Amino acid sequence: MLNYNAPTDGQKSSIDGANSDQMQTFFWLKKAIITARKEQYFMPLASVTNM
Amino acid sequence: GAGAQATGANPGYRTSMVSGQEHYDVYPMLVVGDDSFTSIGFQTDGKSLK
């Protein structure tokens, strides 16, 4: 008796008309996936000379 | 692609295609000794890069 159907994937809920659609159909965590910086090995070896 | 051309007799080594023909790769496998090189620092306040 899913008169809710699935608003995503193109199906329409029964309460909603042909024109309108559900305002919000998902939840957003607002926490992003990020990757760490690559580590360096050759840099600590170098010895600096002033110019 | 620095290596020689790889035919169908490849036993499983890595190859890269250069100008439409596959060629073998070359890998550095490096050794760095003491006091071999130094870094020139320009307005760097004693660090390698700013």
Next chain:
Amino acid sequence: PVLKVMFHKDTNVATVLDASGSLSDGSVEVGTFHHPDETYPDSVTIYHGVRDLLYKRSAKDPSQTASYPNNIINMQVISIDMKATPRLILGTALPRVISTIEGKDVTWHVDVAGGKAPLTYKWQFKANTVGAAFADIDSGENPTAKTATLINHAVTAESAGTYKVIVTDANGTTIESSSLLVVGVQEPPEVASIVAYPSPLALSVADDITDGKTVKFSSLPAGSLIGTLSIKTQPDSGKATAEISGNVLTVKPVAAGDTTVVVTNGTKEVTVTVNVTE
């Protein structure tokens, strides 16, 4: 698909079977319905359709119809017997978007359960250009187009587009899924140097003058485009004669003497050694 329902009064057994099928047990035909509902596909199963069909018919004689107090509304005693082919479901779906670079192989796999064996798979491709429509992939050139798994080798910028797979049942029922391919392209690395291959040194040494040598050239930065090659005839033409056609170079040694040939594309040059022995 349309399903057909038959009801047996004595044993309280309702049979669900295909439109073409029939039963000679002594049951009566109550109605028909679509198992995948047009408006609510994943909302109602066979039980709800059978209940809705049985609500109309009469308790005394399932041949005729009746109002509310006289229907068949007790579903606890009624048993549903299924004889129709199971519905076709998509166990595994294609990934919506696939990202890759030029020169790499990509694979699509789809799994379909249910239906009436055997199953037939057809793959279609739509170009990214405007005003394009789905066209069948040539199964003759790519044998994997007929089967469930599709494999493309060394994709290029033209391989970008939308790919769809169509699965057809024995009865003609069709299910499908779609995927999108994104191909990233980089600029050519530009020519740094050109090298000679069979052979960098001495080419092929043949005592017979009639024998001709074959030379192939390549540019070391992988993916670099090499222009049309040109040769510079150099001092001893009597020792040997060199002629270039396209990329390959042909050298015929007239005399038994060492010769050096320089081949250029207009920016970089290759020094190849020619050794001739009598």
Next chain:
Amino acid sequence: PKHYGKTIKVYEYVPLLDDRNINDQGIDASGATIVNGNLYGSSKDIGNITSKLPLLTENGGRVNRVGFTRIAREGSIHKFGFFYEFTQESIDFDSDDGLM
């Protein structure tokens, strides 16, 4: 939370130098526009690195540009259940008390 559907989505931010970073913001050191915004992908080749290094002239402007992208991922929810039935006579006349 309730009243939000059946889906959860997030953003993933692709780094600068990966091959996933696909965009049209790139300008090479010569100043001309180029197809790829990222300088070089996840390529270990020395040739590409040497050819595509960001080099800056003594008096330079509008030489090197880069761009960024983000990717979204999603998940869904489902429902399961099952039941069983009995009669009073079964539990009343059974020899074993405490069957339920």
